[PDB]
């Protein structure tokens, strides 16, 4: 970390890491290490937790059954090597589908240490830096033996290499696939992303993400669920407000057109409350309005 | 380089290379040398051996009576001036067949000095240390004489070479190239190398790697081979079990794909042995019905 | 680093057993570094009688090179019969580039320089190009002398305004010393590559003898097998080396190397065996076999 | 000598010498000796104790069973030659964690002889005198039997040797390294260094500093115990001051942030007192404190 | 070290100075390098610039005053309370000529501590030790004159991020440098202050040292308008064309020296007739600067 | 000095007591301040028994160096049995070179000169040369004799004109005086240095004979371990030391007596409280401190 303030988020960082657990006040980091710590989320920090997220209770389940005790717990899934966590997860499904609401919650509820790395902190300027970033990161999730890895935009990172792309993505690349799966055998590390589209994911990569949670858009029911949880604590009518007519007028609908439509709900009698305040329930027909 | 930590593991990685050979103890590494130390991977840090390869048993037969005796014994094949070590060594194939688990069973069980390098270690931001990062490589090797440099993910590192390449990438290459195949002859090295696209590798390396093995997507007898030994030391039904299906029913799967179905029908079998001991044999069921 | 001193000192010793008056010369400490990339001819375990296949090449590359270089006192009577100031040996990789260079630095009889980049570059500043200029003052001591540099599309590849300035300044004292206002003596460049076209022109032209080792043909590819299989036992009636030859299309000499090594293997496993617990006769069924014919 | 003040502080270090133990008034020392009984730091100097240090109990007791009662107390640990004190003790660790004010309580509390030689003492432009200079303050040390030479920021004088490290230097570092653990066995000396690059510090030098403290970062209950021994002595409100807040929030502060921040806090609450004064103290608060925070 | 005449006659001159101002002051002696660091001590009387000479940094210059000038000159106010003491380090860091340098000359002249404005070439020494002995003495010159503000201007070049890289004599500098400022032996009322444009050039160690950071940032609107008017003072303005107020929105993106030059280039155009006369004055207007900014 | 007079004439007896021939011997004042700076068998308490893990290092040290300078006689015979004019016990830090000189200085029976920089080095000009040729003076009068230089690699670094004028004569008064001690009188010049590379070739050509003092293995750590915890009680079933040396990874000489030092510390910080107001050694209380 060149920026004075970021060896100060750097500071923070590691001292929040030592909080969670004191194990971690023997363990030296490298100056790469430090680096990729900058970027490290801790649980405080994330606000959206598993409870927030709704309407994908078989996706949250297989998700803790299959991610949180397998990796938390290895004295309880130790009975067999075949019962251990897998070297990367998954999410893919169409954008505005809440992916980074569920990679938040991962990181929260378990408590895992999370590294949230992006594509412009990995690359440096100088050369062959580059690598050296992606294996100091892979040394820190080692580590840090509880810990994810995640990548937003994974389809980007991930994105299947050709002949024609840039020689040091490529390097970076391969250097990521050799750290994954290699010759040196990970920790409990396990890499983490949300894509919107699979093919973009090369075959390798893929193959390092052997789980996948297909984040799909919710059905009638899932519809109805993530409109009560993206409408809860909002002050609403008790007797005319109706979810189910919304839910069946929204065919083939996201959660980021539910969001977007309740955000304008409230909106637009936020307003007559502030016209009021200038000199409280809402109803139907504001959301129905909308709906043609 | 010069770090801390860095300085205890290549002494230990040293320690460890005299206690297997006592004749290296006498032998003297220049700071270069000492860098490139440690990325050697001694057999005790490998968990798979060879008899944890299933499916590749021509594979691994022809690789033994090709690449390890050849190598290993040159006393019993020093009758012939052809029946040495060949110079390198590919395995390419499709994602997921194993090429890096018979590095890894290269590394426990040949008996040769492992180099696990990887491009982080091999790339440096200041002017000529790569280059002599290299041949410091290839001095360890000649040094250590019967040694196996190995490189993960070689298409990236030996990429075909073009002018829009890096300058310090397209040396380094080159550089490998001389020290490789030159005038100043090698001992017992021998480079192996993985990979995806074999078309992705320079033509002038390819040269250099004659030996190579495809390690092709398994058949049906072959996907036995890994579903067996992928489910060992692991409560199987006597009766109802039917591992043949399994294999036959898993069309166009390798084998982290068969490890992830099997990882996942285990964790379905034992979900309900998990909730009891967080205060169950495996059957056909577990691993069809995660199969699709 | 130890090892290097004491082998600048062994190759200085060597050459100086091998020439009575390179004893008096005196060296300085970055033509001593690139000392340590001396080649003598006791490193070299091949003679020029094991490169087959480019026997016309061998003797226009003698009578081109090695002898207007070597005796000097046959060829001075005309000024254009001097030996050329560069040679580059380019072609398709495994023909046999590198088996010409080592038997030129075995069996010609000039001081070799093998000299590589990890030698030539440096970190300090300054040092890259007295590397360069004490690698040609050496040479130019060792009156007779062939500077070898492998790879050479690396070395000598077309400047670039992203080139470093490091390298920028090295090829430009390459070129100052190769063919500049002080003219070197019997001191001669020898390249190989697989790339001729990444060659700098103006390197390019520095090398003015140019040798192509194509992909071999099919007497030349008889050649390369009836050399690899020497001191090999080869059975009289069923194996015959010319089908071999003819069904290998396209294949280079570590082709053709690689395919020897493994069909011995392959004839020779039961031995291996045995010793486990004499060698089989080479067949053509041992050779076919393995080839996709 | 050479300085009247230098002269003058050698007498009367040697005098406190001689005070503190009877037996020193037989010894006689060099030039280069009395030149470095001229860093000779005694306790009534030092004005920081170990109670003064907080955040950092478990190393100041590890510390002490370590390092300063087998050295100060030999009949107790003579039982076993296994119990003898270590030959050298490095504190490294980030800046202003508090290395230094554990130097200092081992210079006033332990009881320990103590010399807090810096560079400038030691090196010289003339051709020998800076090794005579080590090994003289070695021989003193030696004389001075429970002796403790400190070198703070040790990190630069025992550097990585190199050829580009001046022959002086380079000879000077032999001399320490053939000085402190070589041929001659020395006395109870123990060179107690602080730094903040470890990594800067010599292979061989680093093996003769066999017991390494790291002051790291404080903690969320080491930096209450910081705040709560800065804020001795001072009026502090009954109900509104609460330290928890205020040690939770100043994640990633070190003793001198924590220090700095009390000082400003402070200033800040006495304002008033000095406007008044310049023509009491108003107690501190927890609002006061997080106003000059950043949170 | 090396000295010459008519640097002796400086540095004799300064100790007069320091004398008349100081009675106690002349009862101390120093030492040779001590006497060469009396050659970087500052006057008031050599210093042109008060702290009414500055705009714009008002608030600054007052929380300059009550947290640095106060707490070191009237230790007898503040001895209510431990923590009321003045902070070890000072940074005025910033964008280039926004007025550190002027809080630096209104500190020399109008504070009334000796000031020891050292600059980096009477640091450094080719002769082996000089520089660490040179620190060493404007150390304890600092401590000899008990009130004592030393200013290193561009304090980011000697107070570096230490590397392995360094040079031996800037390295044992710079922890010579850092165990004098805060180390063993407690420093008196000695603040060092330095003035930078890159304080991340500037070693977490060093930053430690330097608590109270005072941000001398691009000045607003208001600031521009304040610095305009000091500059002003004394130049006769029109009464009626002239409007200040437009200049100061129109500058945006202006350092103190940049509104110094446009001022400077302004008083030239309205003179310019003036000039011609006198080798042979008009009222400053809004036009005049106007014909120069480019908003 | 008065009291250099007087270490000057107590060695001076204590060398007149070791050899009753020696006391005809004239001395001159730079004689005199060399012979200051020699130590006697009484001042070392290292025994050559008391040093673990080096006995074939210490059987050919005895053999080539200790047996051919005390009987000139019987190794006279052939010239390479003779005791070489240099000895060079370099290796790695804390390894037990000074522990070599150490015993060499007790058991010996040779006079020993073990010299600092710091009396050789002086501010007048020609004084160290005239140190330099008493020292060799003196090394020929005590007809056994060994010159010790610890760090010889600062004293013999690369000759360069960044260097003083002193300093280069004085290497060359050096080299002068050193060649001719080949059949010539018994001295032998030892060094002990970290990092032989230091050593300028010239000087370092002058010493033939080289002892690689290398980083002690499991065997070797064992029997340090073994030496250096004698006389101290140890637990005769709970106390196993061969998993100290495998599970002491790298660990040099000097980092086994820190790790036994701080152990026993910490096993007796019991008895030490009770005696304010001793346990058997285990491995428990090893393990405790070591890191595994
Ligand atoms: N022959 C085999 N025997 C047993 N298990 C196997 C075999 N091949 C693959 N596996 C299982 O599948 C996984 C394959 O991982 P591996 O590291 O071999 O893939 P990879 O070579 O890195 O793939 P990629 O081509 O994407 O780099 C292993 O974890 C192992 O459990
Ligand atoms: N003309 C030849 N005659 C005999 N053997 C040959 C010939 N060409 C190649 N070979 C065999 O092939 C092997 C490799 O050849 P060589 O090293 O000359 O290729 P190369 O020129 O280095 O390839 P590249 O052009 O990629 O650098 C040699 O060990 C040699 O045994
Ligand atoms: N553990 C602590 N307990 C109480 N106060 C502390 C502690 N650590 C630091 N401080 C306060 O912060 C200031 C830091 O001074 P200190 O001597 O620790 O710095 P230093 O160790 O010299 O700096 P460096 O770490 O760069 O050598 C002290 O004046 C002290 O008042
Ligand atoms: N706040 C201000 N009020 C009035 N004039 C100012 C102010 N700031 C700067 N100036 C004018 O700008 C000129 C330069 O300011 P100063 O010397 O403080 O910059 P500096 O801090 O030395 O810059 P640098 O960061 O490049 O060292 C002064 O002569 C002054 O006239
Ligand atoms: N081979 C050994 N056998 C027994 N004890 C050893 C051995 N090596 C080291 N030690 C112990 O560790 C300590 C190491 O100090 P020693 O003087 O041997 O190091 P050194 O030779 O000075 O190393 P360097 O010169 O590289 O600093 C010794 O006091 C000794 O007690
Ligand atoms: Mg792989
Ligand atoms: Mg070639
Ligand atoms: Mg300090
Ligand atoms: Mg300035
Ligand atoms: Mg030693």
């Known amino acids: 970390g060149k920026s004075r303030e970021s060896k100060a988020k750097q500071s923070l960082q590691w001292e929040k890491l030592v909080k969670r657990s004191p194990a971690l006040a023997e363990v030296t980091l490298d100056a790469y290490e430090r680096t990729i710590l900058s970027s490290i989320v801790t649980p405080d920090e994330i606000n959206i937790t598993f409870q927030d997220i709704g309407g994908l209770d078989p996706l949250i389940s297989d998700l803790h059954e299959s991610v949180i005790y397998p990796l938390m717990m290895p004295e309880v899934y130790s009975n067999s090597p075949l019962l251990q966590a897998p070297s990367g997860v998954l999410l893919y499904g169409p954008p505005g589908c809440g992916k980074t609401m569920l990679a938040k919650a991962l990181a929260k509820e378990s408590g895992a240490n999370f590294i949230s790395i992006r594509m412009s902190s990995i690359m440096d300027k100088w050369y062959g830096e580059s690598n050296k970033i992606v294996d100091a990161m892979f040394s820190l999730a080692n580590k840090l033996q509880p810990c994810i890895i995640f990548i937003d935009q994974i389809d980007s990172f991930l994105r299947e290499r050709s002949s024609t792309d840039h020689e040091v ?15 040196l055998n990970n920790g409990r590390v396990m890499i983490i992303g949300a ?27 899932q519809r109805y669920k993530i409109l009560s949880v993206l409408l809860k604590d909002t002050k609403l009518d008790e007797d005319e ?33 502030i016209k009021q305040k200038r000199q409280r329930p809402l109803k139907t027909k504001d959301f129905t309005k909308k709906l043609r």
Chains 1, 2 share one sequence.
């Open 169 to 183: 993505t490529a390097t970076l690349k391969a250097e990521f696939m050799t750290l994954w799966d290699g010759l």
């Open 195 to 221: 894509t919107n589209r699979i093919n973009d994911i090369d075959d390798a990569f893929l193959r390092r993400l052997p789980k996948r949670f297909l984040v799909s858009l919710p059905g009638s029911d």
């Open 241 to 273: 407000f109706d979810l189910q007519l919304i839910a069946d007028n929204t065919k083939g609908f996201s959660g980021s057109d539910l969001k977007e439509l309740c955000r304008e709900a409230a909106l637009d009698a936020a307003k007559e409350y």
